[PDB]
Amino acid sequence: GKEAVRANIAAVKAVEEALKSTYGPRGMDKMLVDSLGDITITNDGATILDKMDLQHPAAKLLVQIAKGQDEETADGTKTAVIFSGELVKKAEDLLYKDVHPTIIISGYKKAEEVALQTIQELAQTVSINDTDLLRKIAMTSLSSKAVAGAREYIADIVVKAVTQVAELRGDKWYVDLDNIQIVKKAGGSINDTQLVYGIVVDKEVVHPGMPKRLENAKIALIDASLEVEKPELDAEIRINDPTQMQKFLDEEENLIKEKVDKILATGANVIICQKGIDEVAQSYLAKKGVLAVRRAKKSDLEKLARATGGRVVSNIDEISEQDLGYASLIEERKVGEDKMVFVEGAKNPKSISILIRGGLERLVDETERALRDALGTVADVIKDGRAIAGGGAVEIEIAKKLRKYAPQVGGKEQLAVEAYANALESLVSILIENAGFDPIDLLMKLRSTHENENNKWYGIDLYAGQPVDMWQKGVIEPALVKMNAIKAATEAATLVLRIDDVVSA
């Protein structure tokens, strides 16, 4: 009976106590000091659970379901855990009062039914042209991150990037993130942030004698070395003769003009590689009038291949007119204090790039995280097409609607249902609390202003501190994330109740 089941509940309740203080943007920050002295300040639900040395099986079963998803978004995760641990919490008081755990699982199951269908008969249809909407949903992702600069810049780009790549897949829109490169440089400002309609190779040209801008450049993506490897790389030479030395390294020098000539046999305007380009081979490309780039990321040859229509080639005796790329005009421009080659006017319109700049050496990294999550989120908004008002709105409803339902559902099973409703309202209470107001007072002030039907989207505006329409202040969010959180948590929750006993090894 009561015995081991408490210890389990208790473990769950502890894990809740590790995230409680960090929910929403008035959330506090947890310090994590790494063993080699290195410091990390965070409020990320995952890390705080992932880096935690748990020894309690309950807690490990609960966080595997809570923390992780087999989805691109990393969001709803603090909700998933908080909501898990409150549902378990509120359930404990029913067992104190002697209700069978079997009932409370069925009760939470009937509540889970309704709660879920209550999101569905209420989301609003959002599709591609609802661009004046996606700008807001995006700020709702970026606003709790560290970005100090204007969010409007970043919101505007994120929208165009998703809409650029969107393509009908079975007569409904789909987007793949892989057609978008994200390049970042510290210093400068966020006003220098932009979308390039091309690909950007962050290695400059071989000599400035090469054209500054080339018209209709037939690109050559060469994975193979355009430089010598050293015959002494494995072990020391066995040549004792400088006459033999000469004729060998000459024939090796004539081998790189061969490699060059075997690619210029196809008549490319531009030649880019991921390894060196010899000092005889740089002079040789310069006298032919080609634009060459030396030692670029294997990462970017790839990014230019499926953009310009080209293929990355690892063998000169294999490059053909079929393998070259097409781009209308390739040029080299200066980004901050580094020159970089840009290859605009490529054959794929889905393929684009983003230049993030501004802020410190770690803040620019977290601006790239924020823009990555915002970009994913907006594309998920297109992939699904439902978006609801945040700030507690759909939540309060799932409670009130459930509370009216409860009377009719059954005997003991009532108390259970009524419990699921109260636990959700506990979430909005924790939220109000960390925001800086009295919970019972603000919740009541909302459940009177949320009794009539026309106040459907009413929540509590965190800074104003009083019940208003969240939708009409931009606070809108993905209806499916905040729906699978209810499924993740209620699973985890009910699983804690499912363990009768433990006999271990």
Ligand X SMILES: Nc1ncnc2c1ncn2[C@@H]1O[C@H](COP(=O)(O)OP(=O)(O)OP(=O)(O)O)[C@@H](O)[C@H]1O
Q: Could you tell me if 137 and 475 are in contact, meaning their C-beta atoms sit under 8 angstroms apart?
A: no
Interacting residue with ligand X among 325, 390, 467, 478 (CB under 6 A): 390
89: partner contacted, choices a second copy, ligand X, Mg ion, none (Cβ within 5-8 A by kind): none
Touching ligand X, residues 433-462 (CB under 6 A):
459-462
Q: How far is the CB of 409 from a second copy (least distance, A)?
A: 11
User: Which 339-358 positions form the footprint of ligand X (CB under 6 A)?
Assistant: none
Cα→Cα distances 423→245, 275, 337, Å = 82, 60, 55
Question: What residues make contact with a second copy under the rule CB under 8 A?
Answer: 97-99, 407, 411-412, 414-415, 440-441, 444-445, 448
**Minimum CB distance to a second copy smaller for 94 or for 271:** 94
Binders of ligand X among residues 8 to 27 (CB under 6 A) are 23-25
Q: Please identify which residue in the block is written with the tokens 């009794």.
A: 451
> Of the candidates 78, 22, 71, 117, which has an alpha carbon nearest to the alpha carbon of residue 489?
78
- Which residues inside 142-181 make contact with ligand X, applying CB under 6 A? 143-144
Per rule CB under 6 A, is residue 78 in the interface with ligand X? Answer: yes
* C-alpha span between 334 and 450 (Å, rounded): 56
Among 427, 475, 483, 496, binds ligand X (CB under 6 A): 475
Q: Tell me how far apart the alpha carbons of residues 146 and 137 are, in angstroms, rounded to a whole number.
A: 17
Selection from ligand X, a second copy, Mg ion, none that 412 binds (CB < 5 to 8 A by kind) is: a second copy
Residue with tokens 């840009």: 342
The interface region with ligand X, picked from 76-84, 129-137, 157-165, 398-406 by CB under 6 A, is: 76-84
Task: Tell whether residue 230 is among the known ligand binding residues.
Answer: no
With residue 372 as reference, give the H or E element that holds it.
helix 363-384
Q: Select from Mg ion, a second copy, ligand X, none the partner in contact with residue 411, using the beta carbon and a kind-dependent cut-off of 5 to 8 Å.
A: a second copy
Query: To the nearest 5 percent, what fractions of the chain are helix, strand and coil?
Result: 50, 15, 35
Please report how close the Cβ of residue 294 comes to Mg ion at its closest, in angstroms: 43
Two tokens, residue 161: 């990037």
Residue number with the smallest Cβ distance to ligand X: 390
Stretch that binds ligand X, among 72-80, 122-130, 256-264, 374-382 (CB under 6 A): 72-80
Q: Which entry of Mg ion, ligand X, a second copy, none binds 123, CB below 5 to 8 A by partner kind? A: none
Could you tell me which of 25, 427, 41, 368 has the C-alpha nearest to residue 184? 368
309 among the known binding-site residues?
no
Please give the structure tokens belonging to residue 283: 């002079």
Binding segment for ligand X (CB under 6 A), chosen from 50-58, 69-77, 238-246, 375-383, is: 69-77
**Bridge partners for 478 per DSSP:** 387
The CA distance from 447 to 172, in Å, is 38
Residues 6+ apart with CB under 8 A from 102: none
Count of residues engaged in binding Mg ion, rule: CB under 5 A: 1
In 3D space, the residue among 305, 314, 303 whose CA is nearest the CA of residue 275 turns out to be 314
Distances (CA, A) of 259 to 275, 346, 356: 13, 26, 37
- Judged by the rule CB under 6 A, the positions of this chain that interact with ligand X are 23-25, 45, 75-79, 140, 143-144, 390-391, 459-462, 475, 477
Residues of the binding site for Mg(2+)? 75
Residues of the binding site? 23-24, 75-79, 144-145, 391, 462, 477, 482
